Design an enzyme around this catalytic site. Structure first.
Site, mmCIF file in Angstrom:
data_model
loop_
_atom_site.group_PDB
_atom_site.id
_atom_site.type_symbol
_atom_site.label_atom_id
_atom_site.label_comp_id
_atom_site.label_asym_id
_atom_site.label_seq_id
_atom_site.Cartn_x
_atom_site.Cartn_y
_atom_site.Cartn_z
ATOM 1 C CG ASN A 34 36.939 38.455 32.851
ATOM 2 O OD1 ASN A 34 37.509 39.244 33.598
ATOM 3 N ND2 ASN A 34 36.512 37.258 33.263
ATOM 4 C CE1 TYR A 68 37.466 38.285 41.657
ATOM 5 C CE2 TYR A 68 35.917 40.129 41.738
ATOM 6 C CZ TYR A 68 37.084 39.567 41.258
ATOM 7 O OH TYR A 68 37.864 40.294 40.391
ATOM 8 C CD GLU A 77 41.059 38.815 40.486
ATOM 9 O OE1 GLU A 77 42.086 38.300 39.982
ATOM 10 O OE2 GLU A 77 40.078 39.152 39.780
ATOM 11 C CE1 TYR A 79 39.757 35.235 41.290
ATOM 12 C CE2 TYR A 79 37.479 34.602 40.854
ATOM 13 C CZ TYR A 79 38.642 35.220 40.458
ATOM 14 O OH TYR A 79 38.693 35.841 39.235
ATOM 15 C CD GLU A 170 36.218 36.027 36.962
ATOM 16 O OE1 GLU A 170 36.315 36.018 38.213
ATOM 17 O OE2 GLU A 170 37.198 36.259 36.225
HETATM 18 O O1 XYP Z 1 36.154 45.281 39.570
HETATM 19 C C1 XYP Z 1 36.625 44.936 38.250
HETATM 20 C C2 XYP Z 1 37.245 43.593 38.311
HETATM 21 O O2 XYP Z 1 36.254 42.631 38.651
HETATM 22 C C3 XYP Z 1 37.827 43.188 36.970
HETATM 23 O O3 XYP Z 1 38.416 41.978 37.147
HETATM 24 O O4 XYP Z 1 38.835 44.194 36.507
HETATM 25 C C4 XYP Z 1 38.262 45.564 36.474
HETATM 26 C C5 XYP Z 1 37.633 45.948 37.823
HETATM 27 O O5 XYP Z 1 36.990 47.225 37.745
#
Ligand code: XYP
Length: 183
Positions: A34, A68, A77, A79, A170
């Protein structure tokens, strides 16, 4: 214009990201785990209007191209996904929002003890996912306030403390190439 460069990877596979002039960046990857790479702002704003042009977005497998970012208090989080590869992300359906010429499905999801800007945490995702892939290579605008306010109408209220906010490439267990300019 942008002020922030983000280059995060879980170290699995090869991810080569370049911080180019201005709001431009590129990333090439092969068999990644990832990663989240992109340009934008170190402090997000619910009223920011973001523009980008993806000179290339060619995932081979699962990759997203999205506005994002993160909030804290609570940890969320979020999107706005304009393009994807082989996998369209989804969660629990909440409604739609129409913005910048596209219609987006709205989803929520819970992530239990998962990676985050603050390490392993239980947190929530807010998603807008375009119903079809947006054109690549065009000057595209995301009027984020439209998404914020559509989310609010479904009780998806963002946290009070704002972390970064980027147009992010991503990848997830995939390969690919992207080249994007943000402003
Ligand atoms: O910003 C980062 C994030 O994008 C990721 O998903 O998990 C770790 C974080 O530091």
């Amino acid at each position: 214009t942008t002020n922030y460069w983000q280059d995060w990877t879980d170290g699995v596979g090869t991810v080569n990201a370049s911080n180019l002039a201005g709001g431009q960046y590129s990333v090439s990857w092969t068999n990644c785990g990832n990663f989240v790479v992109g340009k934008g702002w170190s402090t997000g704003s619910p009223s920011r209007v973001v523009n980008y042009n993806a000179g290339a977005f060619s995932p081979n497998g699962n990759g997203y191209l999205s506005l994002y970012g993160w909030t804290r208090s609570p940890l969320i989080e979020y999107y706005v996904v304009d393009d994807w590869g082989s996998y369209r992300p989804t969660g629990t359906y909440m409604g739609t929002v129409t913005s910048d010429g596209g219609t987006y499905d709205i989803y929520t999801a819970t992530r239990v003890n998962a990676p985050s800007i603050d390490g392993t945490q239980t947190f929530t995702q807010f998603w807008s996912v375009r119903q079809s892939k947006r054109s690549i290579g065009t000057n595209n605008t995301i009027t984020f306030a439209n998404h914020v306010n559509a989310w609010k109408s479904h009780g998806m209220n963002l946290g009070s403390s704002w972390a970064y906010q980027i147009i992010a490439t991503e990848g997830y267990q995939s390969s690919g190439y992207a080249n994007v300019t943000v402003w």
